[PDB]
């Protein structure tokens, strides 16, 4: 089926957009010290899966990465624990700087796939 | 939910007492660790300073 390409590439576009938004949010919150209720910011990631044989890619869910918080010592802070160690986001920088580029490249590649498929479908529309 | 916007905030000042000059002027005072001189603001209400 050549119609399924549209909702395969749309799924790919949506998944890559979600991944790029997650990476941008992590980069923005790379240094945020607290949330709305004292909960430290946690790096988040998306889960990709196949639609199903094989099909498009769907984002199953968004999960906070389970890594120890890079806690720092600020005793004169209300959020400090009993030992004065406040918790900071466990977000690197190279990871997101590469995730953005990879997501953009995949997005552009799927755009090219959709363009080619649409062109050949329109060409087939005038058989004979 | 994926977007988490960022805003800046200032959780008040810091009360660490800075160092002090010895100007020898007879009417120059310095407070203790948690002292405050009480003055009268422009609107009549009181305020605390160092």
């Amino acid at each position: 089926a050549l119609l399924n390409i549209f909702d395969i590439a749309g799924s790919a576009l949506a998944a890559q957009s979600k991944r790029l938004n997650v990476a941008a949010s992590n980069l923005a919150n790379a240094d945020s010290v607290t949330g709305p209720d004292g909960q430290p910011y946690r790096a988040k990631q998306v889960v990709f899966q196949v639609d199903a044989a094989t099909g498009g890619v769907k984002v199953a869910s968004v999960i906070e990465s389970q890594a120890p918080e890079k806690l720092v010592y600020e005793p004169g802070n209300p959020l400090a624990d009993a030992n004065g160690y406040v918790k900071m986001p466990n977000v690197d920088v190279v990871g997101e700087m590469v995730n953005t580029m990879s997501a953009s490249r995949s997005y552009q590649a799927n755009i090219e796939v959709l363009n080619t498929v649409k062109s050949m479908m329109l060409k087939t529309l005038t058989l004979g | 939910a994926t977007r988490t916007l960022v805003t800046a905030s200032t959780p008040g000042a810091d009360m660490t007492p800075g160092q002090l000059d010895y100007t020898s002027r007879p009417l120059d005072v310095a407070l203790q660790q948690d002292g405050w001189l009480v003055v009268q603001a422009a609107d009549g209400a009181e305020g605390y300073t160092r």
Binding site: A14, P36, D37 | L5, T7
Partner: peptide, 21 residues
Amino acid sequence: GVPGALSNQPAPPNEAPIATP
């Protein structure tokens, strides 16, 4: 329910409070 589908119920507004009251 699944994202991208059609439902006759409009989504509730999205809000981002700074601090929980």
